[model samples]
Target: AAQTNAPWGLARISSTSPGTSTYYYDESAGQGSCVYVIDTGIEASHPEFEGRAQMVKTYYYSSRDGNGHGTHCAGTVGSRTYGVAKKTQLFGVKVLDDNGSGQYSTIIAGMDFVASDKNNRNCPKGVVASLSLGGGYSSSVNSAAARLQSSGVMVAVAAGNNNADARNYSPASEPSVCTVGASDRYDRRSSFSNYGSVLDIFGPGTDILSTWIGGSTRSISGTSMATPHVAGLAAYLMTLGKTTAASACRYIADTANKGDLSNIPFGTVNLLAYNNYQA
Candidate 1:
């Protein structure tokens, strides 16, 4: 079933239990695209991935997942079962350590690696950088993301978990990145998600289920959970020849499910949705 390109997000279950509401795809289920998860790391040996994951680099220690956060986010981006782009290859770039903390320089190094190696791997469509971590505003980090975008990697950043304006946050507030906010099953903003005009879109984040570190699946929350939805979508769009790193964000922002969010500025900043296409 490695070549199966069915819509992988159709099976829906619940919030209290271990399951995602649903995610959908169209022509390309991320067949040749790659998503670089820049976080703690990933459990590359996990069965949910079926061995399609690669460890690009680790700033601290080995590139094995310890905190479980990175693996969970990766699952939402490209795991065979929980992902939006079911066939996309996954790459683990360990920026944060086991404590879920890392310096700005470490993150820059991770993005640098992605920009450098993407072409070396022959993925001419480029890669999607799914960043689920954030801190106070850093023009340096924003610049790094921009550099990757210029080098053809789509950057999807979390709009922070704090209930504040995302414009005041880092990477999320950074222009040109796909700034993702958290939404629940009802298409309403999650209470903890950062919001503002800067956010590009919302995604199912509250009580979302995904693959965990120990070859298991678990439910978790945060705008961190929302970031991968957009990242996966960007990767899927790449396979269809409908996107570049910078343009994909704008296209998704323009085509997302609109007029549904209840507590966010920018009426057009709506939930992430699939647009069916065969090209």
Candidate 2:
């Protein structure tokens, strides 16, 4: 089932789970594309995603079945008939193993692998990177992200779920990265969301539903879920017009829906509107 209009592709990266029904609908409208997900392993053969996966890069640094977190996130961001970017490819990097967490060295190593490896034929030079996990900021990490950004590899990170100051940490707080916050369909800030001048934008995070390994679906809360909404929108924008990380980031911010808490400073995070920004 494909649309008659020219397809508009999108990519999403979130918690090891999905947000809601809109995930698949968004993807169908645009046709199945690909999204690079850096997380645990994926259910490569899930029914919802029978044959619509293109893994350009993979690194199983951790043990197999790494806490099923990556699988959940993949469902939200891009599962056939369930993900926001269902038609997209998932770059599964098992950075976290069965223990559910990996060291800083492992995480950094994954970044370097994705950035340097040029032999992965499936990975095009212009593809984007969707990162949903992050903590405190580090000059070394930022330096790596800057390199990725400069290499035309778009990296989007979660703006930490601690709900602390925006300037608090790594990937999210990193100057080169596009940090995101959480928002509901009502465009209201989730009480748990961290906000400030540093926050680049926001996305849906409240009661998100997504697929699991054994033909199941579940829900989760946090800015972790919301960040993928931005991830999905960024992919769509990249397909629509500007493909660079800077251009994608700029378009999203310019078209974002300023949420109700305008009085609080940071404003709204509108994925759909951001998709339409360039047009």
Candidate 3:
């Protein structure tokens, strides 16, 4: 009776089974937690946001999102209709530009902003930073991600779409962050998702439907689509006293559908992320 209607991805996260077509979640539903989307800017005006979304930071002068990736990612993180954390406060940190690209400095700056806000005001007890983009390898970005954890922000990063070892990616390779890979609806690793020991968990990514620019929706496939699911799960866990990044990651591992996903790489953990709720 607790089962409820949900998207395939949301339903997949709600249980260990693969084809239930339903989702369940805590009653709090991410209330009082903050989820920071560090990507292209988000369209805070999108109706799906239900007015919970806001642009906190942007490298561009304007707060608008020319690229749709950020909005889509935000929708997955905390939109009312399609979000993993239905009531989580959404903050868009627009480090990337219209082309969905940004320099290391800009990215680092965004990280700094998030960390300081959490450390200073400490408004939200739980904060999760979601990054759905990655690069070859960069010590600066990796180090910055660690700083976020030290400042009390859980960081979740994409494992990349290269289909190679996730260790080759920047923040994904960063040991302190939660690195995410992509899984299809069948509980198989996405063909384009990077794998290896660096991946901490897998999330539904193939053909994910979420809010796009101009208040519409689109379905996309990539490891980029997977990171926010972990981040959103991290946000949900935060309200349950998983305030620390390490604690949140551990809870996710403990509650996850471990060893259930197929085609896992040699070093990658066979953990598929789960929400541990049924409606």
Candidate 4:
């Protein structure tokens, strides 16, 4: 059966799945919002990414152009021609060199760079840090995040790609960070995505479609792919006056495709069931 309208329930469900590109197409045609890509660095000149990227703070750890990984990840987050947040700004903060690895200190420092409001020009939009990379949950990172939140900074982090428990990491396992899991097209937990009580939520990660280097694009699979979708949606909701991360998460859960995900009978979401809020 052909799906009707931009069904939030279906789209949210599909967002967690490792389904086909058709699943992503369910919501890709809409407008986009800005997001901070605090990773290696994106290929700002790529046609799909041209004019789509804004330099946040280029932390040259490797002293390179685009580390390929960063560009690909950025393309998924905010490529103008091909990304969830295409119309949104991509805050390119080169925290990692070209090695696809960086220390917890460097990454957290980049986080501070993005969310800092104390006259920092590099971070214009405050900070909505998208950590596609992870070192696991750290008390120190959470402390840093708490400080950022004290200044109105929000974050979205990949739970982990190891497909194991999140508690083994330093950052993603942290309670302060929004630990994202992966879901399949049918809204089931992906076999590769880490799952546990620490997992905040799920997003489309498996076989996800995003921009590649050059003018081309392809679907890359990873928890990295899933993290940005949630971040991008949060950006959009913020534009719609959904300022707090809690509110945005509630909205997603409220409108979530709970067909196979939830088993509760008395859920809180009741648009037609509870019209009194508007009344």
Which is the leading candidate under lDDT? Answer: 3
Query: Which lDDT tens digits does candidate 4 get at residues 1-279?
Result: 122332232244334332323223323222344567777777677777668576657656343335576776777666653355445566677878777788878877877776663344333333355778877567887666555545554577787877677777656767666667665545545567766666666776766656655656676667787777767656544544544544554555455444454221232221110000110
TM-score of each: 0.89, 0.78, 0.95, 0.76
Give the TM-score (vs. native) of candidate 2.
Answer: 0.78
Candidate number with greatest TM-score: 3
Which pairs clash inside model 1?
Answer: none
Candidate 3 has an lDDT of 0.86
lDDT of 2 by residue, 137-222 (tens): 67776677667666666677777777677677766777776777776544456667777666777766656666565667667767
* Candidate scoring better on TM-score of 2 and 3: 3
Whole-model Cα lDDT per candidate? 0.78, 0.57, 0.86, 0.58
lDDT of 3 by residue, 1-279 (tens): 233666778888888788877667886778888888999999999999988888988888777899999999999998876788888888898999999989988998899899986654333548899999889799999999999977778889999999899898888899888889999999999999999988888999998889999889999988889888888988887876654565787678777898888899778899989977644
TM-score: which is higher, 1 or 2? 1
Q: What is the lDDT of residue 160 in candidate 3?
A: 94
Could you tell me the lDDT of residue 269 within candidate 1? 68
Ranking by lDDT: 3, 1, 4, 2
- Sort the predicted structures by TM-score, highest score first: 3, 1, 2, 4
